[PDB]
């Protein structure tokens, strides 16, 4: 199965109350391992996973440098988008970036990502082929023409296929104990009468990693995607995840409904029936 590295950056302007806040964060799969916060006392790239502290002081020096550079650049990119879009200097604005690579079971590079969003909308992105750009609008066309001319795609493709996969592969080795582990979900059901006619059946899955999971309700063995409430997978705070799925069951038909849990950590899908 795939593994993946992602770095997510957020730059937020705040005219009058300083210069842009910049927060960057690195993940291997669903495990945070580094951070940088322009408002952090340290002003370094800090570790957030046990297995990264394994890296020498040459790693922490080179990584702090690269992310401070990112910081200063996306600071100027907030100024440029402001001009391109003809916006007042009064308003606060957001510039987010995401980059990283996926590798297969074998450490083989699978795909790479380089994307920007301005004020919550796509701005510019490297396409799947790592050769071309998608510009969301006319402002991004300008950036696209600039980057086409300066051969920025080739430069990024180099990093995505090289340094990015090299790092991910090193992390998957040094963090093997943690990253190649598979914590199966601990399951249970609850019953909540809503009316005189109906009740809620809620299917719980707790303490699982990775976050990828499927909770499905079946009625008489047929899938009940209509009238299933599914909450966003949420972090427990300990590096595992929690999720539930619910149906409003016609009261006195609880036995007709079964919950199905699928997870990388389970040899077979689990089935749960309501038991009073």
């Amino acid at each position: 199965g795939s593994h993946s590295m992602r770095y997510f950056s957020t730059s937020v302007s705040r005219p009058g109350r300083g210069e842009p806040r910049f927060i960057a964060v690195g993940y291997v799969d669903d495990t945070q391992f580094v951070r940088f916060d322009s408002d952090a006392a340290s002003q370094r790239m800090e570790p957030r996973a046990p297995w990264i502290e394994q890296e020498g002081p040459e790693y922490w020096d080179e990584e702090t440098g690269k992310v401070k550079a990112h910081s200063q650049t996306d600071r100027e990119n907030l100024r440029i988008a402001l001009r391109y879009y003809n916006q007042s200097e009064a308003g606060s604005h957001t510039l987010q970036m995401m980059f990283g690579c996926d590798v297969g079971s074998d450490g083989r590079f699978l795909r790479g990502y380089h994307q920007y969003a301005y004020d919550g909308k796509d701005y510019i992105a490297l396409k799947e082929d790592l050769r071309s750009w998608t510009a969301a609008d006319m402002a991004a066309q300008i950036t696209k023409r600039k980057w086409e001319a300066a051969h920025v795609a080739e430069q990024q493709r180099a990093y995505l296929e090289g340094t990015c996969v090299d790092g991910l592969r090193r992390y998957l080795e040094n963090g093997k104990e943690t990253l190649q582990r598979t914590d199966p979900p601990k399951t249970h059901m609850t019953h909540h009468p809503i009316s005189d006619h109906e009740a809620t059946l809620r299917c719980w899955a707790l303490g699982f990693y990775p976050a990828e999971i499927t909770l499905t309700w079946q009625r008489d063995g047929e899938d009940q995607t209509q009238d299933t409430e599914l909450v966003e997978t949420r972090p427990a705070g300990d590096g595992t995840f929690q999720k539930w799925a619910a149906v409003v069951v016609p009261s006195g038909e609880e036995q007709r409904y079964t919950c199905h849990v699928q997870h990388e950590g389970l040899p077979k899908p689990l089935t749960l029936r309501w038991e009073p």
Partner: peptide, 9 residues
């Protein structure tokens, strides 16, 4: 590993 270079818009 973070990438090395970042471009202006």
């Amino acid at each position: 590993n973070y990438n090395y270079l970042f471009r202006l818009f």
